[PDB]
């Protein structure tokens, strides 16, 4: 059920920050592959001598790509005189994260009412502090606590897009790509031990268990009061588990997958699949045909036969619980290592606004895929 | 003139290797932006537990993108038992290069008759050894010496594409992109002091001075016997020079630009410019119109008025020496730092095969751009 136990007021996912080697190349690949618009920047051209940061947006989804410049450009700065636009940035931590884990998510950012308040209450309730509340241009407050591994939960609060110090991208350079992606649905972490990770995060946030699963993994989902911030966590089950392989290749815990909601998953997948081999993202191998014939059966009130055939053309998976229906598909790993990947999703049902997490997370697609094969 | 002084037999440029944070994302961005085909790989799927390496090709141009996995996957290997396909690879050097310089070229690779012989003679003649000759699957020999900064000159020789241990990419994943790029024309290094860098490299190769220039830089070009391997080197001129800015942002000397020959520079630029804002490469600001009106004058026997207007539509620059004509244009930096960039070029003249370096390197486009502005 839903105790509505949050320890502070949380609004919505706000942004995901990637720590990269070269922000430029990752941002440009992602823009093209996912259909996100180049919308803001913080770098040498805006007077940032510390880090290069590029923001891509699609609907309300915000992806930020950051890399460190040579320390030598800002060696004379101190925290009080910094030209960095994200005060929590550290060359050393960034290089260290990237060396250890390769390309991946550093920050899962949520918008809250009062970032100073959320930080204070989180730490008071057991959160490990990462970067203290700082007010940027008397307008925005940012703070960070450890989530799992070297991933931080970042709190953002606005007095009245992006951050101060970021410049909006002029239309010539800002081509309006858009393949239908609209918001972040969920962000999932892989950890060695689920129990303690749940205890820790639910401990400092007050997020309640929305779900659990028990072929490879045990998992559980933590959610905010209105269930619009959703944070699933997986552990491996030994006696490889895919979660175990992740941990080995990533050098420990970290973010496993980002699930992006599409307002039209058919159009999103047509557009992404067109570009897979020409700079974009590859997709995991499709289910056999026997999976699609079996879908007539499970979701017949939801999707017509032609709508199911469209799923089969795009390799979309469909799952259905008590209350709603889930369309989903997974990309292959986003970079060199077999670590982070993306999920594209769309939800049918639970209408009122649509209830966060309608249809679950696809845990029925486990048995159903291996039944078809 | 041309003394044909090479100390060993050199054939052609063979490949350029980029050291990246995530090879996958850079390779996919480059493939799409430059129209190169994904043609070979060495990674976890081929049993390489040490590095991820992806090869893109367009005509004879070969771009290789490499990143290190977690050291933990191969911690039990020793050099004699390695699963790496490029024996010279080192996790530590790779991470160190990348931390220090960001995304950039590690190796300028040339095909020679005998790589063991070229290495021996180079070192005997003052080259600083980087990795000794190793024979791969009794079929290919690879060796490396220092070129400038942390860039190496790599020698490759074949008994009878790519390397052993690399697998060819299956056609489904190998989309046949092609925007007209066909081979590497030249590879340019930025160094603090030109004199000593020339002395060193000409010292160990026997390459002769093809050229020199003397607004910002002093430069000189070294070339092989048949002038098909061309290696220009720049130094800054103080009292910023763009070469100086490079050095600061790159943390010292390294590769400045790669010049890619196109069999149709108009088509290449149409295709690249279409994709700049959708995952591809941005281009430096175009010359004013006054530059194009002035081209009627300088190159009237080479290009018609409509051919010149096509140059103006694409922002192409044209330069012309004693013997030939050069069409060229420069991309903006390829990654986060204001360091490495790409040049697209096509040459008219010097026909026999076309003479290496026909038309020079565009040093006339210096005064001519600032005359138009
Ligand atoms: Fe998911
Ligand atoms: Fe050049």
* Domain termination residue (choose one: B155, B178, B201): B178
Which residues of chain B have a CB within 8 Å of the CB of A30? Answer: 25
CA separation (Å) from A94 to A22, A45, A330, B257? 12, 21, 28, 27
Task: Give the Cα separation of B315 and B286 in Å (integer).
Answer: 5
* CB-CB under 8 Å, A279 with B29: yes
Strand partners for B339: none
CATH number at residue A256: 3.10.180.10
For A280, which of B28, B73, B173 is closest by C-beta distance? B28
Task: Give the Cα separation of B83 and B76 in Å (integer).
Answer: 11
Q: B240 vs chain A: nearest CA distance in angstroms?
A: 14
* CB-CB under 8 Å, A22 with B336: yes
Choose from A24, A65, A169, A251 for mutation: most chain B CBs within 10 A.
Answer: A24
For B23, which of A52, A177, A336 is closest by C-beta distance? A336
The closest of A188, A277, A265 to A234, measured between CA atoms, is A188
Please check whether residues A65 and A186 belong to one and the same domain.
Answer: no
Q: A22 vs chain B: nearest CA distance in angstroms?
A: 5
* CB-CB under 8 Å, B21 with A98: yes
* Domain termination residue (choose one: B125, B159, B178): B178
* CB-CB under 8 Å, B279 with A28: yes
Task: Give the Cα separation of B207 and B227 in Å (integer).
Answer: 9
* CB-CB under 8 Å, B31 with A279: yes
H or E element that contains B108: strand B104-112
Task: Give the Cα separation of A128 and A120 in Å (integer).
Answer: 11
Task: Give the Cα separation of A12 and A325 in Å (integer).
Answer: 22
DSSP 3-state of A83: coil
Kindly give the pairing relationship between strand B230-236 and strand B254-262. Answer: unpaired
- State in Å: Cα B164 to ligand 1 middle: 39
Task: Give the Cα separation of B153 and B126 in Å (integer).
Answer: 14
Please check whether residues B363 and B315 belong to one and the same domain.
Answer: yes
- State in Å: Cα B121 to ligand 2 middle: 28
Residues B61-73: b if buried by 16+ CB within 10 A, e if exposed: bbbbbbbbbbeeb
- Asked if A222 contacts A10 with a C-beta cutoff of 8 angstroms, the reply is no
* Tokens of residue A104, six digits: 């991946």
Task: Give the Cα separation of B28 and A30 in Å (integer).
Answer: 10
For A32, which of B52, B279, B336 is closest by C-beta distance? B279
Q: A297 vs chain B: nearest CA distance in angstroms?
A: 32
Please check whether residues A159 and A183 belong to one and the same domain.
Answer: no
Strand partners for A348: A325
N- to C-terminal Cα distance for chain A?
35
* Tokens of residue A254, six digits: 């970290």
Total residues belonging to chain A = 373
The closest of A108, A71, A120 to A91, measured between CA atoms, is A71
Please check whether residues B195 and B224 belong to one and the same domain.
Answer: yes
Experimental method: X-ray
* Tokens of residue A130, six digits: 């990462």
**For residue A263, what are the domain limits?**
179-373
Task: Give the Cα separation of B339 and A237 in Å (integer).
Answer: 46
* Tokens of residue B196, six digits: 């000593």
Kindly give the pairing relationship between strand B254-262 and strand B317-320. Answer: unpaired
* CB-CB under 8 Å, B337 with A52: yes
Choose from B19, B23, B25, B276 for mutation: most chain A CBs within 10 A.
Answer: B25
Kindly give the pairing relationship between strand B104-112 and strand B10-19. Answer: antiparallel
- In the 8-state DSSP scheme, what is residue A319? E
Strand partners for B188: B257
Task: Give the Cα separation of B133 and B159 in Å (integer).
Answer: 14
Q: B345 vs chain A: nearest CA distance in angstroms?
A: 22
Which residues of chain B have a CB within 8 Å of the CB of A32? Answer: 29, 32, 275, 278-280
Task: Give the Cα separation of A157 and A250 in Å (integer).
Answer: 31
- State in Å: Cα A329 to ligand 1 middle: 9
- Asked if B141 contacts B113 with a C-beta cutoff of 8 angstroms, the reply is no
- State in Å: Cα B123 to ligand 2 middle: 28
Task: Give the Cα separation of A152 and A147 in Å (integer).
Answer: 5
Ligand nearest to the CA of A219: 1
* CB-CB under 8 Å, B23 with A279: no
For A22, which of B21, B73, B281 is closest by C-beta distance? B21
Closest chain B CA to residue A94: B99
Please check whether residues A228 and A115 belong to one and the same domain.
Answer: no
CB atoms within 10 A of CB A20: 32
Q: A108 vs chain B: nearest CA distance in angstroms?
A: 20
CA angle A236, A239, A243 (to 5 degrees): 20
Q: A337 vs chain B: nearest CA distance in angstroms?
A: 7
- State in Å: Cα B188 to ligand 2 middle: 7
Task: Give the Cα separation of B278 and A177 in Å (integer).
Answer: 7
Closest chain B CA to residue A173: B277
Closest chain B CA to residue A283: B173
* Tokens 């490759």 sit on residue: B156
For A337, which of B69, B277, B333 is closest by C-beta distance? B69
* Tokens of residue B306, six digits: 């409509």
Please check whether residues B235 and B327 belong to one and the same domain.
Answer: yes
Choose from A20, A22, A36, A172 for mutation: most chain B CBs within 10 A.
Answer: A22
CA separation (Å) from A37 to A190, B168, B270? 29, 34, 21
* CB-CB under 8 Å, A23 with B20: no
Q: A281 vs chain B: nearest CA distance in angstroms?
A: 8
- Asked if A281 contacts B29 with a C-beta cutoff of 8 angstroms, the reply is no
Ligand nearest to the CA of A186: 1
The closest of A155, A248, A146 to A201, measured between CA atoms, is A146
The closest of B255, B230, B260 to B243, measured between CA atoms, is B255
Please check whether residues A159 and A210 belong to one and the same domain.
Answer: no
Kindly give the pairing relationship between strand B10-19 and strand B61-68. Answer: parallel
Contacts (Cβ under 8 Å, ≥6 apart) of B151: B105, B106, B107, B108, B189, B253, B254, B255
Q: A27 vs chain B: nearest CA distance in angstroms?
A: 8
Residue B91 annotated as lining a ligand binding site: no
Task: Give the Cα separation of A68 and A88 in Å (integer).
Answer: 12
CA angle B337, B343, B344 (to 5 degrees): 145
Please check whether residues A226 and A124 belong to one and the same domain.
Answer: no
Task: Give the Cα separation of A227 and A115 in Å (integer).
Answer: 19
For A70, which of B20, B32, B251 is closest by C-beta distance? B251
Ligand nearest to the CA of B363: 2
Please check whether residues A108 and A239 belong to one and the same domain.
Answer: no
Please check whether residues B188 and B305 belong to one and the same domain.
Answer: yes
For A175, which of B22, B98, B277 is closest by C-beta distance? B277
* CB-CB under 8 Å, B248 with A73: yes
* Tokens of residue B98, six digits: 């990348």
* Tokens of residue B211, six digits: 């050229």
Could you list the beta-strand ranges (E) of A98-166: 104-112, 129-136, 140-148, 151-158
- State in Å: Cα A170 to ligand 2 middle: 30
DSSP-derived secondary structure for B260-287:
EEES-HHHHHHHHHHHGGGTS--BPPPP
- Asked if A115 contacts A132 with a C-beta cutoff of 8 angstroms, the reply is no
DSSP-derived secondary structure for B118-185:
HHHHHHHTT--EEEEEEEETTTEEEEEEEEETTEEEEEEEE-----TT-EE--TTT-----SSEEEEE
* Domain termination residue (choose one: A178, A198, A221): A178
- State in Å: Cα B323 to ligand 2 middle: 18
Q: A78 vs chain B: nearest CA distance in angstroms?
A: 19
Q: What is the largest CA-CA distance in chain A?
A: 67
Task: Give the Cα separation of A161 and A164 in Å (integer).
Answer: 9
Give the resolution value in Å.
1.8
CB atoms within 10 A of CB A304: 10
Residues B265-277: b if buried by 16+ CB within 10 A, e if exposed: bbbbbebbbebbb
Q: How many CB pairs under 8 A join A and B?
A: 155
Contacts (Cβ under 8 Å, ≥6 apart) of B261: B181, B182, B183, B184, B185, B345, B346, B347
Choose from A26, A28, A250, A275 for mutation: most chain B CBs within 10 A.
Answer: A28
- Count of H helices and E strands in chain A? 9, 17
Task: Give the Cα separation of B240 and B227 in Å (integer).
Answer: 33
Say how many domains are in chain B: 2
Helix pair A305-314, A289-299: axis angle to 10 deg? 140
Which residues of chain A have a CB within 8 Å of the CB of B20? Answer: 21-22, 25, 336
Task: Give the Cα separation of A163 and A156 in Å (integer).
Answer: 10
Question: SS3 for chain A, per residue?
Answer: CCCCCCCCCEEEEEEEEEECCCHHHHHHHHHHHHCCEEEEEECHHHCCCCEEEEEEEECCEEEEEEEECCHHHCCCCCHHHCCCCCCCCCHHHHHHHHHHHCCEEEEEEEEECCHHHHHHHHHHCCCCEEEEEEEECCCEEEEEEEEECCEEEEEEEECCCCCCCCEECCCCCCCCCCCCEEEEEEEEEECCCHHHHHHHHHHHHCCEEEEEECCCEEEEEEECCCCCCEEEEEEECCCCCHHHHHHHHHCCCEEEEEEEEECCHHHHHHHHHHHHHHCCCCECCCCCHHHHHHHHHHHCCCCCHHHHHHHHHHCCEEEECCCEEEEEEEECCCCCCCCCEEEEEEEEECECCECCCCCCCCCCHHHHHHHHC
Which residues of chain B have a CB within 8 Å of the CB of A173? Answer: 277, 282
Ligand nearest to the CA of B361: 2
Please check whether residues B287 and B349 belong to one and the same domain.
Answer: yes
Which residues of chain A have a CB within 8 Å of the CB of B251? Answer: 70, 72
* CB-CB under 8 Å, A249 with B52: no
Please check whether residues A199 and A66 belong to one and the same domain.
Answer: no
CA separation (Å) from B164 to A258, B20, B85, B168? 36, 22, 7, 10
Sign of CA dihedral B123, B126, B127, B129: positive
Task: Give the Cα separation of B27 and A335 in Å (integer).
Answer: 10
Residues B197-225: b if buried by 16+ CB within 10 A, e if exposed: bbebbbebbbbbebbebeebbbbbbbbbb
């Amino acid at each position: 059920k839903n105790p509505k136990s949050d320890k502070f007021k949380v609004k919505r996912f706000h942004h995901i920050e990637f720590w990269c080697g070269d922000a430029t190349n990752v941002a440009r690949r992602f823009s093209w592959g996912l259909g996100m618009r180049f919308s803001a920047k913080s770098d040498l051209s805006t007077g940032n001598m510390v880090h290069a940061s590029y923001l891509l947006t699609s609907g309300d989804l915000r992806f930020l790509f950051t890399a460190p410049y040579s320390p030598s450009l800002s060696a004379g700065e101190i925290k009080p005189t910094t030209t960095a636009s994200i005060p929590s940035f550290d060359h050393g931590s960034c290089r260290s994260f990237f060396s250890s884990h390769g390309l991946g998510v550093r920050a899962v950012a949520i918008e809250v009412e009062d970032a100073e308040s959320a930080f204070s209450i989180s730490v008071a309730n057991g959160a490990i502090p990462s970067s203290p509340p700082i007010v940027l241009n008397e307008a925005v407050t940012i703070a960070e606590v450890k989530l799992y591994g070297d991933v931080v939960l970042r709190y953002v609060s606005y007095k009245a897009e992006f951050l101060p110090g970021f410049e909006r991208v002029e239309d010539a350079s800002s081509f309006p790509l858009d393949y239908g992606i609209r918001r972040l649905d969920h962000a999932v972490g892989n950890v060695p031990e689920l129990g303690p990770a749940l205890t820790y995060v639910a401990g400092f946030t007050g997020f309640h268990q929305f779900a659990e699963f028990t072929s490879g993994l045990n998992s559980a989902v933590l959610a905010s009061n209105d269930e619009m911030v959703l944070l699933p966590i997986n552990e491996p089950v030994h006696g490889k588990s895919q979660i175990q392989t992740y941990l080995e290749h990533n050098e420990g815990a970290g973010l496993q997958h980002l699930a992006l909601m599409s307002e039209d998953i058919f159009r999103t997948l047509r557009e992404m699949r067109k570009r897979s081999s020409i700079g974009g993202f590859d997709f995991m191998p499709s289910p056999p045909p026997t999976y699609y014939q079996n879908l007539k059966k499970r979701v017949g009130d939801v999707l017509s036969d032609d709508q199911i055939k469209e799923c089969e053309e795009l390799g979309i998976l469909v799952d259905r619980d008590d209350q709603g229906t889930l369309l989903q598909i997974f990309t292959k790993p986003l970079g060199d290592r077999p670590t982070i990947f993306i999920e594209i999703i769309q939800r049918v049902g639970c209408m009122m606004y649509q209830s966060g997490g309608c249809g679950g997370f696809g845990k029925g697609n486990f048995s159903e895929l291996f039944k078809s094969i």
